[PDB]
Amino acid sequence: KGGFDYDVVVVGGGFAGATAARECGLQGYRTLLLEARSRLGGRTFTSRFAGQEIEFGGAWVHWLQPHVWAEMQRYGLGVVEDPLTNLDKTLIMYNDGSVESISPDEFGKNIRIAFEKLCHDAWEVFPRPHEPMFTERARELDKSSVLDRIKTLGLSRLQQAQINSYMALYAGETTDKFGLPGVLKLFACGGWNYDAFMDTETHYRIQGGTIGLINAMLTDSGAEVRMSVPVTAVEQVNGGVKIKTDDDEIITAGVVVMTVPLNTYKHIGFTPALSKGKQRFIKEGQLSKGAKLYVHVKQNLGRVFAFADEQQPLNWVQTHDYSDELGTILSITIARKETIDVNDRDAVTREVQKMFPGVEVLGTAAYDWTADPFSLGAWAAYGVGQLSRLKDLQAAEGRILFAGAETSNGWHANIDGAVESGLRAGREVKQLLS
Ligand SMILES: Cc1cc2nc3c(=O)[nH]c(=O)nc-3n(C[C@H](O)[C@H](O)[C@H](O)COP(=O)(O)OP(=O)(O)OC[C@H]3O[C@@H](n4cnc5c(N)ncnc54)[C@H](O)[C@@H]3O)c2cc1C
């Protein structure tokens, strides 16, 4: 349109990027997508362990999540139900390492009590969860951490350990740092209702894996897709942009959509400088230091669930599969990488054995999202005061647009939020290229 190599370049092949490329490709724009890694998905990654398909990152979807569910209808993708109902064993590991077996009914009842107390005012604070700063109350609450509220709730020891564990997981961090409104807003997105919100958590996966939806969008898009091309700089010039790759290739474009994780912006030079509000976000970054671990054990433990509080590593434990022949594959999410050397098998083994004494570890598979230069962190987790400034992160900068789950209004800790932001970006591109 103005002599550039491309109409639009999308940086990042996660869901935010795939969605944006799809929106732009179908408009008939000459569209390029650049991905730093040699694989697609970003903070979703479909892989294999002990002869079965697994998800190392984002995995779970629901019909109460509007953007991803519509995409699933478009591409004809069904759901797979993970065995999260009628549990056999439910455990809590407290800060000091002691393990308590709770009866599954009681376990469920207690986390319910604690969660409903934590999110008691979600309807008044977030009557419009897709406009987070609609009410003044949402703004004033952003002066508080989740821990500040937790301390006022009068929870039992069990209740407090369960909820702190849950929030540690959501934060990818200790709960003193974790912003209170973010959590409320999410609960609000799931119809301000415990049962509804829980059904969205870790229940339904995408049939064919996350990679299937990514491929379906990129295949639909007609965009050129380049793998193993990290972007190192963006300069605004001649009514478009010059994009520099790590090999010192220069690609010109009318517009660029940045979809990279917030914590990775420091790897990219911008000319001119981004706005001060945006520089603040980039220097703070996003909290989460999460990692993902699968352990195969010989013993058949059936359907298990465990919380560990934030001072212990194995914070969220769930059964991926079980049988007498298989044994059990445990799906474990770790809130803070620092709490466990996830690539040291002797350490992982001892930790698993602390949780389940007398278990025999047949194999492990891990993904350390904090060591990966193209994530440098896990899922989006807002610190105190970040949510109320979110517009700084979203705002167009001349011909640079921004997307990614961090920048979404709704389900910011989810695939759905990435999709949302990609739809926004597609629209902002059209407006610029119109
Ligand atoms: C361990 C883990 C588990 C999760 N589980 C769930 C879940 O169960 N359900 C759920 O809904 N959500 C989950 N999430 C979050 C969910 O994955 C995100 O909300 C969403 O998928 C992120 O999409 P994105 O496109 O914004 O980011 P990303 O997926 O991170 O995409 C960013 C892309 O940019 C690329 N990139 C980075 N730097 C450059 C560069 N310089 N040049 C080019 N490309 C670059 C990256 O390689 C990556 O492909 C999870 C996240 C993690 C980390």
Ligand 1 contact, 381 CB (< 6 A): no
Residues 68 and 151: their CA atoms lie apart, in Å, by 35
Question: Which residue lies with its CA nearest to atom 21 of ligand 1?
Answer: 415
Peptide bond into 272 cis (omega under 30): yes
Question: Which residue lies with its CA nearest to atom 32 of ligand 1?
Answer: 260
Ligand 1 contact, 414 CB (< 6 A): yes
Contact yes or no for 200/62 (Cβ under 8 A): yes
- The answer for 385, left when phi > 0, alpha when psi is -120 to 50, beta otherwise, is left
- CA proximity to 16, closest of 55, 53, 56, 43: 43
**Ligand 1 centre and the CA of 342: distance in Å?**
20
The residue assigned the tokens 């398909």 is 53
Contact yes or no for 256/31 (Cβ under 8 A): no
Contact yes or no for 182/149 (Cβ under 8 A): no
Can you say whether the dihedral through the CA atoms of 59, 417, 165, 282 is positive or negative?
positive
Q: Is 316 annotated as a binding residue?
A: no
Q: How far apart are the first and last CA of the chain?
A: 11
**Ligand 1 centre and the CA of 171: distance in Å?**
16
- CA proximity to 225, closest of 74, 72, 11: 11
Residues 234 and 231: their CA atoms lie apart, in Å, by 8
What tokens appear for 302 in the block? Answer: 């059936």
Contact yes or no for 112/194 (Cβ under 8 A): yes
Q: Is 35 annotated as a binding residue?
A: yes
What tokens appear for 101 in the block? Answer: 């077996």
| Ligand 1 atom at minimal distance to the Cα of residue 408 | 26
What tokens appear for 119 in the block? Answer: 């999110």
| Ligand 1 atom at minimal distance to the Cα of residue 367 | 1
Ligand 1 contact, 42 CB (< 6 A): yes
CA distances to 10, 27, 110, 362 from 102, in Å: 48, 55, 10, 27
Q: Is 60 annotated as a binding residue?
A: yes
- CA proximity to 278, closest of 413, 411, 397: 397
Rg (CA), the chain: 22
Q: Is 415 annotated as a binding residue?
A: yes
Task: Indicate the pairing of strand 269-271 with strand 291-297.
Answer: unpaired
Name the CATH superfamily housing domain 1-82+201-285+380-434: FAD/NAD(P)-binding domain (3.50.50.60)
Q: 10 Å Cβ neighbour count for 240?
A: 25
SS3 per-residue string spanning the chain? CCCCCEEEEEECCCHHHHHHHHHHHHCCCCEEEECCCCCCCCCCCEEEECCEEEECCCCECCCCCHHHHHHHHHHCCCEEECCCCCCCEEEEECCCCCEEEECHHHHHHHHHHHHHHHCCCHHHHCCCCCCCCCCHHHHHHCCCEHHHHHCCCCCCHHHHHHHHHHHHHHHCCCCCCEEHHHHHHHHHHCCCCHHHHHHCCCCEEECCHHHHHHHHHHHHHCCEEECCCCEEEEEEECCEEEEEECCCCEEEEEEEEECCCHHHHHHCEEECCCCHHHHHHHHHCCCCECEEEEEEECCCCCCEEEEECCCCCCCEEEEEEEECCCEEEEEEEECEHHHCCCCCHHHHHHHHHHHCCCCCEEEEEEECCCCCCCCCCCCCCCECCCHHHHHHHHCCECCEEECCHHHCCCCCCCHHHHHHHHHHHHHHHHHHHC
**In the chain, where the domains are located:** 1-82+201-285+380-434, 83-200+286-379
Residues 166 and 175: their CA atoms lie apart, in Å, by 10
Residues 100 and 427: their CA atoms lie apart, in Å, by 51
CA distances to 82, 322, 327 from 101, in Å: 22, 20, 20
**Ligand 1 centre and the CA of 417: distance in Å?**
10
Ligand 1 mutation target, pool 379, 393, 407, 409, most atoms within 8 A of CB: 379
Contact yes or no for 255/429 (Cβ under 8 A): yes
SS3 per-residue string spanning 386-424? CHHHHHHHHCCECCEEECCHHHCCCCCCCHHHHHHHHHH
Residues 254 and 237: their CA atoms lie apart, in Å, by 10
**Ligand 1 centre and the CA of 213: distance in Å?**
14
Residue 273's Cβ-count burial label (10 Å; 0-12, 13-18, 19+) is: exposed
